[PDB]
Amino acid sequence: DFDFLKNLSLEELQMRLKALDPMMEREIEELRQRYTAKRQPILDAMDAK
Amino acid sequence: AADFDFLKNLSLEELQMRLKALDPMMEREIEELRQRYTAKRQPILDAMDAK
């Protein structure tokens, strides 16, 4: 909950909003990476039989 | 489990189960991420409606 937003422009609020979605998507992508590294040994162990 | 040397002594069926179990946990963590970003947008949206 930012407080510096009131005395801030409407164009500049829109930018801040727009910046968030890509930040989330990289965070999701990096989340998905931890899980790819979690799956990897399990998959390889299945190949080992 | 992060180590191959442990998991390779486990049965095929148990390995399929450990594998399937990661999906719901991941999807939960993602939803959680989404909910935190909902909180970041709220102050912007409010500030916009106040102008």
From Swiss-Prot, chain B:
Domain SARAH: 4-51
Coiled coil: 9-42
Domain of life: Eukaryota
Modified residues (Phosphoserine): 11
Protein name: Serine/threonine-protein kinase 3 20kDa subunit
Gene behind the chain: STK3
